[PDB]
Design a protein around this nucleic acid. Structure first.
Ligand SMILES: CN[C@@H]1[C@@H](O)[C@@H](O[C@@H]2[C@@H](O)[C@H](O[C@H]3O[C@H]([C@@H](C)O)[C@@H](O)[C@H](O)[C@H]3N)[C@@H](N)C[C@H]2N)OC[C@]1(C)O
Ligand SMILES: CN[C@@H]1[C@@H](O)[C@@H](O[C@@H]2[C@@H](O)[C@H](O[C@H]3O[C@H]([C@@H](C)O)[C@@H](O)[C@H](O)[C@H]3N)[C@@H](N)C[C@H]2N)OC[C@]1(C)O
Ligand SMILES: [Zn+2]
Lengths: 118, 87, 216, 129, 98, 208, 96, 25
RNA sequence: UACAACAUGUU
RNA sequence: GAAGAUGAUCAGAUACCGUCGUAGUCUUAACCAUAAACUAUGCCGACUAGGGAUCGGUUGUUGUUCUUUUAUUGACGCAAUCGGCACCUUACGAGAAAUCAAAGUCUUUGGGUUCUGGGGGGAGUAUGGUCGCAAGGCUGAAACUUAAAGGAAUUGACGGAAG
C-alpha cells in the first residue's frame, strides 16, 4: 500500500504550523509553495510532502484536528475560552427562591448557625 | 553526641517527624515539609514567616498525613472544630 | 563545562549550598555527580567485583560486564554503585557515577568512654539484601575492623575504626553482601538514641531561602 | 491460653508504636505490668498511662511518645548472678550507654544500673531501649 | 510451583465432593471442578423455522426449547475450545466474558 | 492565630450549596470519617461545609507561603478541571498541567519538560495517580481535592469536596484562586469582590 | 512459638532432644558407632601395610579417558583386600 | 521410573524373599 | 488414520 | 468391570480404541489402617490495614409483596453485633522468589507447647521385634557409592499447545 512515513508527515505538520495562511487546498499550488518553503533534496519527497499537506489542509477545513498548532487556532480557542455568560448559574435567581436541597442539608446548614431561606 | 571536653561531634542533627517523632532519613524522598503562611489581622500573609510541619514517608504512605496535619494545625491555632479527639 | 539542570545543582555551583549536610538535612534528591565532587572533593573509589552476566539469544550469548564500586571520604561519607555495561571501563566509570550519587552520611560513635573523636558505631545495626544479612556491632578501641575484605573496605571508606561484623546467608554473592552492609551502615542515622531526643526546631531548606538563584 | 500477660502488654505496646499510634490499650493489667511500665516511664520511653477498673483485672491505656524502639520480655525469667548481668546487657542492648535490662529482685523491680548501684540481683524480666 | 490459589477447583470448606462423568469421554471429575455449561437452544434449526411454520397445523404455536446442562473434564474442555489457556494476570478473572 | 473575618461568610455558603459541593460519594473511607455530616435516603453522604471552607483557607495559606509562584503546580487529567487549572495558573502565575501527565515529568531530569514544583495541587487523587506517585519520589507536598471515596495515600492536605461535578470542581478551584489572591494582596479585602465572574473556571462542552 | 520448649525446668527435654538429633550428623554418628574400628579397611589407622596381589588398570570416568595404574592389596593386620592408586608416571614398574 | 512402580517392584521382590526364608525356618 | 529414535568428548 | 477371551490399529503391540466378561462394584457380621488422607501450611493465646458480599444467632428499623385491608403473619428491604466458609486491594511487614492478613509482630533474635529435618543415593532396604487370615502395617540400620541432586525465577529455543 501507500502509507506515508514519518518524515513526510512531520514535514507537513511543520509546514501547516509555520505557514498556514499561505498553504492552500490545491496540490499544484502546494507543490510550488513547498518548493519555496522547504529545501527537500528530491522531487519525489517534495511531492509526497506537498500532497500529504494538501490532504491535511482538506481535512483541517472541517474543524480543528488534534496534533497541529499553527498560530491561528489558538486565537479562536482562547477568545472562545473567555465565554462569560451575562446571567450566572450559581446565583439563586435561576432556582426560583429556595435552595432545592433535601431536608438533610437543610438541617446541616441550620447546624452551621445560618438563617438561610430554603 | 558529645565527648570529654563538651565539643559536639554530631555530623548533623536530623529532623524528626512532627506526627510520629521518627527520624527523617537523608534518602527519605517520600517525606515532605509543609510550610503554611501566617496571616496578619488585615487578612494578608506575612513576608517570609511560616510555621513548618515535617512528615515522614511512613505516615504519608499510610494515608494518615491529612489527619496528622489536621491535629497539628488545629492545635497550633490554625484550625478549629475539624479534628476531633473523640471518635 | 557542566551547566546544572536541577535547582540543587544550580545552588551548589553558585556557592549557596556549601555542604552535603545541608542536603541530607532536608532529603534533597541528588542527580548530578558534579554536586558531590564539588561538595566532597577528596573521594576514594574502589572496584570491589567485576562479573560477567549473559543473555541468551537465538545467535548466542550476550555478555555484559557488571561492576561494583564503593566510594568514600573516610570521614563519615560512603556510597555504593552498581552498573552493567558492555565494556569493563565504561561499566566502572558509570558505577563510580552511581556510587557518588548515592553517598549517605554515617553516624560514628563511641563503644565505651568518649575520649577523643567517635571511633565506632553508636548502636548495633543490620541490613539485608537477598538472603544476606550483615550485622555491624560497636567494638572497643584498639580492635581493627573485624570483617571480610569487602565489608572491611566499606568500613574503611566510611571512616570507621572499631567494629564487629557477623554475616549470615550467601555472603559469596558480593553485590548482595555489599548492599546489605550499605543498608546496615546507613541505619545509624535512623536508630533514635536518647541524645537525639532533644527537639531541634525545623529550619528552612536552602532551596527555600534561595528560591531565585535556584530557578535558573 | 494466656501464659504471660507482660508479654501480651509489651507486644501490644511495640505493635502500636510501630504503626505510629499515640496510644495503646493494654488488657489485662497486673502489678508486674504496672511496675515495668513505671520503669519505662521514669526513663521517658512512655508518657502517661491510665488504669481502668473493670472489677475483673483492669485495663491500661498508655500514651506513647514515639521515643521507643523495642520493648519485650525475656521468657523464661532466667536466674541471673550479680556478674552475669554483663552478658545479658551485651546480648540484648543496642549499646553500653542507653537501654535497660529490667530485673525483678528481692529489692524490687528495677533496671540493671540501679541493680549495680544497690548490688542486688535476681531474675531477668525484660528490656527496653 | 502453585499455579492457582484455588488449586483449580472450588472446595474451600469441605473434604470431598461426588464426581460426575464427562460428556465426551465419561471421565469421573469432581463437580466443583468440572467445567459446566447451561445451554438453551431452539429445537428446530433456524433455516427450517419458516418451513415448519408453513407445515404446522396450528396457528400461533410456540416452538419447544431444548434444555441441557453440560459437564466437561478439563482435557475435553480445552480440546473443544470451551475454555482456553490464559495469561498469568488474566487467569485471575472469574467474571464471564462479553 | 487567625481572625474572625473568614468564618465561612454566607455568600460562600451560597456558592458552595448552589454548586452541589456537599454531595459526597455514596461510599466513604475510614480516612474520610471526619468529613461526612450524615447519610440521606438516596445513599450519598453529606460533606461538612465549614470543614471544606477552612481546609480551602489552609491550602491557600500553603500556596501563599511559597516563593516564586510558578513553583505551585496545578493539574487535572479529568475533562472537568483543565479550564479550572489553566484559569488558576493565569490568575495566580502558577504552572498548570492539563490533559496528559507524562510519566517522568518530575523525576526525569533530561526531558525538556522537566519541572521542579514545590507543591502539587491536584483535582482527583485517583484519576491523577501519576502526579502524586511521582511527587512521592522527589519530596513534593500534595494538596488534593478529595471526595468521600478518593484514596488518601501520599497526600498532605485534603480539601473535602465533590470532585465528580463540573460546577463543583470549577467552584472549588475558583475559591482557591480567590483566597490566594486575597492573601497575596491582589484583592484588597474580603468585602471587595472579584473581576472574575464565578461561571468562569467552569469547563465548557466542546460542542456548544 | 519456635517449636522448642522454653520452660525454665525443661533442661531434660532440651538436652535429650539435642542428643537424639545429633545422630543425624555424620561425624558424630561415625565416632559414636565406632565405624572406623569396626568397618574401615584400615581399622582407624592413618596408614596400613599389605602384599600386592595383582596390577590392575582402571578406566578414568567421564569426561576423562585414561588408564589409572593401581594395585590390588591384601592388608596384613586384618587380611582385607583394598585397591590403591600408585601415583606417578611410570611408578607402576617399581611395584611388583 | 515412576517411583510408584519402583515400590511395586520392591513389594514383589520382598514377597518372594519371604518365600525363600520360610523354606528353611 | 499413522509420527520410533539421533554414538563419546570439548574448546 | 481388574484378570481372561476376542476384533482392529501397528514394525511389533500380550496398550491406547471396539465386543464380551471372572473377581470386584451392593449389603450383613468381622478384618485390614493405608492415599497428592493436601490448605503439601501442628495446636492454644495476644496484637497489627482497608472493602464489599455470604451462612447461622441475636438486636433496632420501612415508599415493598403476602395473610386481611389492620395486628402476636411470612417473605423481603435498611443499620448493628457475635460466630463461621471464603473473597478483593495494598504491601505495611515477610520471603530465594513464587507469593503470604499470615508464611506479619523473627540478628531490635525469648507468650506456652507437641512432632519432624540435617547433601544426593543405598532405603523405608536388611535385621530383630510387633500387629494382621493374607495382602501387608508399624518400628527400623549399616556397609558401600557419589559432586551435586534440588527450589524459585530470567532470557532463549522447542511443542503432534492457543491466537
Ligand atoms: C537405630 N537408630 C536409632 C534411631 O532409631 C533413634 O532411636 C530412637 C531413640 O533415640 C529414642 O529414645 C530417645 O527418646 C526418648 C524419648 C521418647 O523419651 C528418650 O527418653 C531417650 O533418652 C532417647 N534416647 C527411642 N525411644 C526410639 C528410638 N527409635 O535415634 C537413635 C539411633 C541410634 O539413631
Ligand atoms: C524378573 N523380574 C525382574 C526382577 O528380577 C528384577 O531384575 C533384576 C534387575 O533389576 C537387576 O538389575 C540391576 O543390575 C543392572 C546391571 C547392569 O548390573 C543395573 O542396571 C542395576 O545394578 C540394576 N538395575 C539384574 N542385575 C538382575 C535382575 N534379576 O527387577 C526387574 C524385574 C522385571 O522385576
Ligand atoms: Zn472428557
Amino acid at each position: 500500500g501507500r502509507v506515508r512515513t514519518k518524515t513526510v508527515k512531520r514535514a507537513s505538520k511543520v509546514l501547516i504550523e509555520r505557514f498556514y495562511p499561505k498553504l492552500t487546498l490545491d496540490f499544484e499550488t502546494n507543490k510550488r509553495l513547498t518548493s519555496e518553503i522547504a529545501v527537500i533534496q528530491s522531487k519525489r519527497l517534495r511531492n509526497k510532502i506537498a500532497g500529504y499537506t494538501t490532504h491535511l489542509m482538506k481535512r483541517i477545513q472541517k474543524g480543528p484536528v488534534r496534533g497541529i498548532s499553527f498560530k491561528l487556532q489558538e486565537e479562536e480557542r482562547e477568545r472562545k475560552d473567555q465565554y462569560v455568560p451575562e446571567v450566572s448559574a450559581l446565583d439563586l435567581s435561576h432556582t426560583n427562591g429556595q435552595l432545592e436541597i433535601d431536608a438533610d442539608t437543610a438541617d446541616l446548614v441550620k447546624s452551621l448557625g445560618f438563617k438561610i431561606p430554603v | 553526641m558529645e565527648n570529654d571536653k563538651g565539643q559536639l561531634v554530631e555530623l548533623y542533627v536530623p529532623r524528626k517527624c512532627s506526627a510520629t517523632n521518627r527520624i527523617i532519613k537523608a534518602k527519605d524522598h517520600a517525606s515532605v515539609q509543609i510550610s503554611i503562611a501566617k496571616v496578619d489581622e488585615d487578612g494578608r500573609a506575612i513576608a517570609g514567616e511560616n510555621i513548618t510541619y515535617a512528615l515522614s514517608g511512613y505516615v504519608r504512605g499510610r494515608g494518615e498525613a491529612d489527619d496528622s496535619l489536621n491535629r497539628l494545625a488545629q492545635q497550633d491555632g490554625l484550625l478549629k472544630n475539624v479534628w476531633s479527639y473523640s471518635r | 563545562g557542566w551547566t546544572p539542570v536541577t535547582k540543587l545543582g544550580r545552588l551548589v555551583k553558585a556557592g549557596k549550598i556549601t555542604s552535603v549536610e545541608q542536603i541530607y538535612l532536608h532529603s534533597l534528591p541528588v542527580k548530578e555527580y558534579q554536586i558531590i565532587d564539588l561538595l566532597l572533593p577528596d573521594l576514594k573509589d574502589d572496584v570491589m567485583k567485576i562479573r560477567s552476566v549473559q543473555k541468551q539469544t537465538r545467535a548466542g550469548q550476550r555478555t555484559r560486564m557488571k561492576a561494583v564500586v564503593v566510594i568514600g571520604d573516610s570521614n563519615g561519607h560512603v556510597g555504593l554503585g552498581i552498573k552493567t555495561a558492555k565494556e569493563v571501563a565504561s561499566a566502572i566509570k558509570a558505577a563510580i557515577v552511581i556510587a557518588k550519587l548515592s553517598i549517605i552520611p554515617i553516624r560514628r560513635g563511641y563503644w565505651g568512654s568518649n575520649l577523643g573523636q567517635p571511633h565506632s558505631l553508636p548502636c548495633k545495626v543490620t541490613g539485608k539484601c537477598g538472603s544476606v544479612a550483615v550485622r555491624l556491632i560497636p567494638a572497643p578501641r584498639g580492635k581493627g575492623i573485624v570483617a571480610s575484605p569487602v565489608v572491611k573496605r566499606l568500613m574503611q571508606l566510611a571512616g570507621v575504626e572499631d567494629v564487629y561484623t557477623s554475616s549470615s546467608g550467601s555472603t559469596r554473592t558480593t553485590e548482595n553482601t555489599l548492599k546489605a552492609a550499605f543498608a546496615a551502615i546507613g541505619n545509624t542515622y535512623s536508630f533514635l538514641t536518647p541524645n537525639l531526643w532533644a527537639e531541634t526546631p525545623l529550619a528552612a531548606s536552602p532551596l527555600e531561602v534561595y528560591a531565585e538563584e535556584a530557578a535558573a | 491460653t494466656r501464659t504471660s500477660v507482660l508479654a501480651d502488654a509489651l507486644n501490644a505496646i511495640n505493635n502500636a508504636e510501630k504503626t505510629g499510634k499515640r496510644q495503646v490499650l493494654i488488657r489485662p493489667s497486673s502489678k508486674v505490668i504496672i511496675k515495668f511500665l513505671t520503669v519505662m516511664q521514669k526513663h521517658g520511653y512512655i508518657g502517661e498511662f491510665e488504669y481502668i477498673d473493670d472489677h475483673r483485672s483492669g485495663k491500661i491505656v498508655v500514651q506513647l511518645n514515639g521515643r521507643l524502639n523495642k520493648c519485650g520480655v525475656i521468657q523464661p525469667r532466667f536466674n541471673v548472678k550479680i556478674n552475669d548481668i554483663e552478658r545479658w546487657t551485651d546480648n540484648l542492648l543496642p549499646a553500653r550507654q542507653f537501654g535497660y535490662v529490667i530485673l525483678t529482685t528481692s529489692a524490687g523491680i528495677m533496671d540493671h544500673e540501679e541493680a549495680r548501684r544497690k548490688h542486688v540481683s535476681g531474675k531477668i524480666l525484660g528490656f527496653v531501649y | 510451583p502453585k499455579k492457582r490459589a484455588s488449586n483449580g477447583r472450588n472446595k474451600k470448606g469441605r473434604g470431598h465432593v461426588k464426581p460426575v462423568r464427562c460428556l465426551n469421554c465419561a471421565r469421573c471429575v469432581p463437580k466443583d471442578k468440572a467445567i459446566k455449561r447451561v445451554t438453551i437452544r431452539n429445537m428446530v434449526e433456524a433455516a427450517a423455522v419458516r418451513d415448519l411454520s408453513e407445515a404446522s397445523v396450528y396457528a400461533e404455536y410456540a416452538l419447544p426449547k431444548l434444555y441441557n446442562k453440560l459437564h466437561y473434564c478439563v482435557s475435553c474442555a480445552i480440546h473443544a475450545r470451551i475454555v482456553r489457556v490464559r495469561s498469568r494476570t488474566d487467569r485471575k478473572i472469574r467474571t464471564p466474558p462479553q | 492565630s487567625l481572625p474572625a473575618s473568614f468564618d465561612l461568610t454566607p455568600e460562600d455558603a451560597k456558592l458552595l450549596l448552589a454548586a452541589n459541593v456537599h454531595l459526597g460519594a455514596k461510599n466513604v473511607q475510614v480516612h474520610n470519617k471526619p468529613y461526612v455530616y450524615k447519610t440521606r435516603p438516596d445513599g450519598m453522604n453529606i460533606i461538612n461545609i465549614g470543614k471544606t471552607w477552612e481546609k480551602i483557607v489552609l491550602a491557600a495559606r500553603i500556596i501563599a507561603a511559597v516563593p516564586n509562584a510558578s513553583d505551585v503546580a496545578v493539574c487535572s487529567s479529568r475533562t472537568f478541571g483543565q479550564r479550572a487549572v489553566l484559569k488558576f495558573a493565569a490568575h495566580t502565575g502558577a504552572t498548570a498541567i492539563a490533559g496528559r501527565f507524562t510519566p517522568g515529568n518530575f523525576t526525569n531530569y533530561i526531558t525538556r519538560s522537566f519541572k521542579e514544583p514545590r507543591l502539587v495541587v491536584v483535582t482527583d487523587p485517583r484519576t491523577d495517580a501519576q502526579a502524586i506517585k511521582e511527587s512521592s519520589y522527589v519530596n513534593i507536598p500534595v494538596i488534593a481535592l478529595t471526595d468521600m471515596d478518593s484514596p488518601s495515600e501520599y497526600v498532605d492536605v485534603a480539601i473535602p469536596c465533590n470532585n465528580k461535578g463540573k460546577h463543583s470542581i470549577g467552584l472549588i478551584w475558583w475559591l482557591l484562586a480567590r483566597e490566594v489572591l486575597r492573601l497575596r494582596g491582589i484583592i484588597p479585602d474580603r468585602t471587595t469582590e472579584w473581576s472574575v465572574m464565578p461561571d468562569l473556571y467552569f469547563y465548557r462542552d466542546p460542542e456548544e | 512459638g519456635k517449636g522448642k520448649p522454653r520452660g525454665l525446668n525443661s533442661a531434660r527435654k532440651l538436652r535429650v532432644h539435642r542428643r537424639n538429633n545429633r545422630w543425624a550428623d555424620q561425624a558424630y554418628k561415625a565416632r559414636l558407632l565406632g565405624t572406623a574400628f569396626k568397618s574401615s579397611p584400615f581399622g582407624g589407622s592413618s596408614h596400613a601395610k599389605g602384599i600386592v596381589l595383582e596390577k590392575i588398570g582402571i578406566e578414568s570416568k567421564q569426561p576423562n579417558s585414561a588408564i589409572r595404574k593401581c594395585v590390588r592389596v591384601q592388608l596384613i593386620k586384618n587380611g582385607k583386600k583394598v585397591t590403591a592408586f600408585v601415583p606417578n608416571d611410570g611408578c607402576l614398574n617399581f611395584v611388583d | 521410573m515412576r517411583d510408584k512402580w519402583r515400590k511395586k517392584r520392591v513389594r514383589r521382590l520382598k514377597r518372594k524373599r519371604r518365600k525363600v526364608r520360610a523354606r528353611s525356618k
